[PDB]
Design a protein around this motif. Structure first.
Motif, short mmCIF file in Angstrom:
data_model
loop_
_atom_site.label_atom_id
_atom_site.label_comp_id
_atom_site.label_asym_id
_atom_site.label_seq_id
_atom_site.Cartn_x
_atom_site.Cartn_y
_atom_site.Cartn_z
N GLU A 143 0.17 -12.96 18.39
CA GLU A 143 1.99 -12.52 18.19
C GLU A 143 1.93 -11.68 16.89
O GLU A 143 2.55 -10.73 17.04
CB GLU A 143 2.82 -13.67 18.33
CG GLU A 143 4.06 -12.85 18.08
CD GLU A 143 5.24 -14.01 18.66
OE1 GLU A 143 6.08 -13.50 19.07
OE2 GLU A 143 4.92 -15.18 18.22
N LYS A 144 1.40 -11.96 15.96
CA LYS A 144 1.26 -11.17 14.60
C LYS A 144 0.39 -11.35 14.02
O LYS A 144 -0.65 -12.15 13.97
CB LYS A 144 2.47 -11.88 13.89
CG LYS A 144 2.49 -13.15 13.50
CD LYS A 144 3.72 -13.77 12.58
CE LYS A 144 3.70 -15.20 12.60
NZ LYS A 144 4.78 -15.69 11.33
N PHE A 145 0.11 -10.47 12.94
CA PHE A 145 -1.09 -10.20 12.15
C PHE A 145 -0.61 -9.80 10.61
O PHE A 145 0.54 -9.36 10.48
CB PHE A 145 -2.34 -9.43 12.68
CG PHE A 145 -2.05 -8.07 12.60
CD1 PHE A 145 -1.25 -7.44 13.64
CD2 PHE A 145 -2.54 -7.01 11.90
CE1 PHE A 145 -1.15 -6.23 13.89
CE2 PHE A 145 -2.50 -5.76 12.03
CZ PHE A 145 -1.79 -5.30 13.04
N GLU A 146 -1.40 -10.09 9.59
CA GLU A 146 -1.00 -9.66 8.41
C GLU A 146 -1.08 -8.58 7.95
O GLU A 146 -1.66 -7.55 8.43
CB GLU A 146 -2.37 -10.52 7.22
CG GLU A 146 -3.60 -9.85 7.56
CD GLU A 146 -4.52 -10.22 8.74
OE1 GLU A 146 -4.07 -11.04 9.52
OE2 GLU A 146 -5.74 -10.16 8.68
N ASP A 147 -0.47 -8.25 6.88
CA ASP A 147 -0.59 -6.96 6.10
C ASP A 147 -1.90 -6.73 5.48
O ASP A 147 -2.28 -7.26 4.70
CB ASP A 147 0.60 -6.69 4.96
CG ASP A 147 2.02 -7.01 5.77
OD1 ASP A 147 2.35 -6.24 6.64
OD2 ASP A 147 2.71 -7.76 4.94
N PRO A 182 7.18 -10.50 5.38
CA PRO A 182 5.73 -10.32 5.07
C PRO A 182 4.64 -10.88 6.31
O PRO A 182 5.07 -11.82 6.80
CB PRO A 182 5.47 -11.06 3.78
CG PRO A 182 6.80 -11.86 3.54
CD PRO A 182 7.82 -11.14 4.50
N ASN A 183 3.83 -10.27 6.43
CA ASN A 183 2.57 -10.68 7.35
C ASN A 183 3.28 -10.87 8.63
O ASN A 183 2.85 -11.91 9.39
CB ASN A 183 1.96 -11.73 6.84
CG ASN A 183 1.17 -11.34 5.65
OD1 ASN A 183 0.68 -10.46 5.20
ND2 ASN A 183 1.71 -12.23 4.49
N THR A 184 3.85 -9.79 9.24
CA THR A 184 4.68 -10.20 10.51
C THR A 184 4.15 -8.72 11.58
O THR A 184 5.03 -8.44 12.22
CB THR A 184 6.00 -10.23 10.66
OG1 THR A 184 6.55 -9.26 9.95
CG2 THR A 184 6.41 -11.52 9.87
N1 LIG Z 1 0.95 -15.84 10.78
C1 LIG Z 1 -0.30 -15.58 11.15
C2 LIG Z 1 -1.25 -16.54 11.42
N2 LIG Z 1 -2.69 -16.13 11.69
C3 LIG Z 1 -2.80 -14.75 11.57
N3 LIG Z 1 -2.00 -13.91 11.21
C4 LIG Z 1 -0.80 -14.30 11.03
CL1 LIG Z 1 0.30 -13.10 10.43
#
Ligand SMILES: Nc1cncnc1Cl
Ligand SMILES: Nc1cncnc1Cl
Length: 165
Positions: A81-85, A105-107
């Motif tokens: 659904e989401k991944f980090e900066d 952050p990280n969305t």
């Molecule tokens: N929350 C998250 C969990 N695993 C990988 N990336 C993210 Cl942004």
């Protein structure tokens, strides 16, 4: 090795407008570039084809990529659904910059924006990962359909997209 190029064929209330192509900085932000590339080709089974630019503010940006909720509240990445900066190496230097939208952050998901002005206040907050290569004229035409609040006067869609070269 060569940064990938992707294209979007834009339509306005279903009428063809033109093509915008982008260089993706895979050399600097490979994970983020790969997400955009894959969503443009649709190779994971989902992506940008048929989605809209839901928020267009002249003198600021065109935002799109919400293929799950169609309004700025949705989207998903190829990684979940989401991944980090990934990094903030690249800056918002002027029109044509391609950068990830986010909700904190990280969305990062799938939503992105094309700058139509220098947006330096976003530096270090939004990941820059590409730039318009050809078709800035088409972006400028799209921009004309926006408004101060971002609502569009005609529906601006990605009629087709994919990878070039
Ligand atoms: N929350 C998250 C969990 N695993 C990988 N990336 C993210 Cl942004
Ligand atoms: N996913 C998302 C939700 N709300 C605002 N922006 C984004 Cl990118």
């Amino acid at each position: 090795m060569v940064n990938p190029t992707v294209f979007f064929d834009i339509a306005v209330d279903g009428e063809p407008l033109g093509r915008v192509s982008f260089e993706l900085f895979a050399d600097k932000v490979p994970k983020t570039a790969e997400n955009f590339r894959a969503l443009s080709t649709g190779e994971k089974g989902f992506g940008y084809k048929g989605s809209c630019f839901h928020r267009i503010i002249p003198g600021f940006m065109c935002q799109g990529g919400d293929f799950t909720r169609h309004n700025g509240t949705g989207g998903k990445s190829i990684y979940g659904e989401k991944f980090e900066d990934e990094n903030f190496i690249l800056k918002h230097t002027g029109p044509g910059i391609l950068s990830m939208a986010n909700a904190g952050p990280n969305t990062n998901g799938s939503q992105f924006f094309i700058c139509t002005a220098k947006t330096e206040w976003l530096d270090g907050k939004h990941v820059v990962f590409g730039k318009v290569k050809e078709g800035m004229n088409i972006v400028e035409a799209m921009e004309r359909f926006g408004s101060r609040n971002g609502k569009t006067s005609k529906k601006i869609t990605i009629a087709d997209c994919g990878q070039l070269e």
